[PDB]
Design a protein around this ligand. Sequence first.
Ligand SMILES: CC(C)c1cccc(C(C)C)c1O
Ligand SMILES: CC(C)c1cccc(C(C)C)c1O
Lengths: 168, 168, 168, 168
Amino acid sequence: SQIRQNYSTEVEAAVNRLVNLYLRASYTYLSLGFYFDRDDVALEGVCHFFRELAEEKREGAERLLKMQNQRGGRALFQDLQKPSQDEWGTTLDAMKAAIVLEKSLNQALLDLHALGSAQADPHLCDFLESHFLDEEVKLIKKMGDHLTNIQRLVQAGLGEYLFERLTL
Amino acid sequence: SQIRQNYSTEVEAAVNRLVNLYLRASYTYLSLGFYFDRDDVALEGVCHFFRELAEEKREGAERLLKMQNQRGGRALFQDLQKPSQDEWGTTLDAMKAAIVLEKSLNQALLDLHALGSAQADPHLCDFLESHFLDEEVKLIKKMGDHLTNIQRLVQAGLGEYLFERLTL
Amino acid sequence: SQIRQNYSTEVEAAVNRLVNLYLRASYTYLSLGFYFDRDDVALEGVCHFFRELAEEKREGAERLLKMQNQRGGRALFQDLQKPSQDEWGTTLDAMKAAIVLEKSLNQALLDLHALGSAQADPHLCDFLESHFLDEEVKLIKKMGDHLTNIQRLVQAGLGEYLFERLTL
Amino acid sequence: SQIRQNYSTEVEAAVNRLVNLYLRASYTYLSLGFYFDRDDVALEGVCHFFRELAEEKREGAERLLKMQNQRGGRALFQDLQKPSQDEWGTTLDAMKAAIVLEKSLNQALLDLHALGSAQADPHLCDFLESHFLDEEVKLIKKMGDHLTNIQRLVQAGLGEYLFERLTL
Ligand SMILES: CC(C)c1cccc(C(C)C)c1O
Ligand SMILES: CC(C)c1cccc(C(C)C)c1O
């Protein structure tokens, strides 16, 4: 590439892998959202919470792809694996799966940051810090807060209704 | 009729029967609404839910009657039978009766659609699809969602109060 | 499902397959869009055209999933296959691939409509006609119009620039 | 300096060198801009493109000088060498020279970042990342995009006119 400068093949490949992880996460949240929209589940606030996250993760993938092109790297897409479950249980089960998913995304971001530092790529390091690292910390804190409130509420049906009505 | 074209006597008769079913449904919802307004029942949100449905079903009957005249058919009214119960039990009992009622209306609409298709009456088919079929699907989904939340909430008195306060 | 009425298992399965096709199409358009954003391709209007289509196809999948739940069917997601190409050639090549893709989506919609008619499911038939069939016809006409103008313009570099500047 | 803290003499010297490079770049763009304003060249959009860049590079030098004083370092100015050419050829030649110039500025920024990291000077590292590194990546991507479009357009006179009219 005529514009490529200080951008290693290792970072380029890791960025493509991270795009795939963000799109997989968006797909997982799409599945979580529509599960809570089932007439036999029917928790609208929970459906809204996860649909908003599907949108945020798709936006993250798109930002990564834009950065890949700005640096002269080449986007390469892979098959997007289906989510790990077809049915997601209670709000508590769903929030626990979501925090597992976010921690895995955060770890991938931290691994990519470490790779960037190793490769002396400060543009990459700044990009991640600016657009992703703090967003993930904030989101994981919010999910942890939700998990604590859900757990405090377990008359489990009553608690699940109240959380959806009064928090979400 | 000077204007009548492609409108069978079978469809004309079925439309009159459907008007009677819609007016019977409006009457049933009027009864449900005022039951929840009793001082010894006293669930205002539930009363409002059913009074709004009585209005929607009367409007449906009026749309059908307007269509009957647009096609050159002749409205024929029959005695409107009183609702199946005088007292309607809990919110849960009431919502179960309402979903039974809506499924019966939906089935009558589907039967009339099938009759229209058999008679090659596409104006009728479009009319039903446009004004009734989707309205019924949406309403039945909403009632199913409510039933699931009511069931999750059954300390049954506490749950009935909370549903009326926080959903309706 | 407590709400399910006149909704066959065959239609339910076909709707899940159609969701997968719409999400695959959105993914294909995401790939097309970012390819035209490469510094060595650099056709912004073309990138915008395809990114807007990725959004439209994702929205289509979401509408289908909402309908699946309204009818009492159960969403089932499958692995999303990667797009058929990694690099998309000229604007002409890309527009030809897009019209192939849209014709395949349109055929799937027509097949689902035929299945609905066979199953006497008029809600499904109306849903498809209202939200999808006309959108596809309009889009395919627009792509055909673009293909004709692109072909008329092939000094091929000059023509590709002018189309992006003055049409897109 | 009473305020100087964690600011090495090596960084101080490198910052002064970088100021000189930014001012040299501003001077080069001033020359490029007025060349395209010649009556025998007469490409107004190209003149505007380069005059705007002369302004951006002067602003960069001024930000660096402000930072030098904030840290307690001492600005030292050197003779500003004249630009490498007196006449700049075609728009294509000019854009190629501009991308060479920007890549040299970007490399100097990356070298200064590496020096800062070596000296454990995180204020410097943040300053560069915040105000310069991303600006350079964006600008180099934009120039690469322009070069690709210029090259696609080479009836070379016609292509040069069209690019100036429809892109710049
Ligand atoms: C945002 C969310 C609905 C989503 C899930 C799965 C795949 C995609 C794209 C890649 C088609 C997607 O946008
Ligand atoms: C009791 C109720 C369903 C009803 C019956 C008959 C006529 C009307 C008018 C107001 C349309 C009506 O509202």
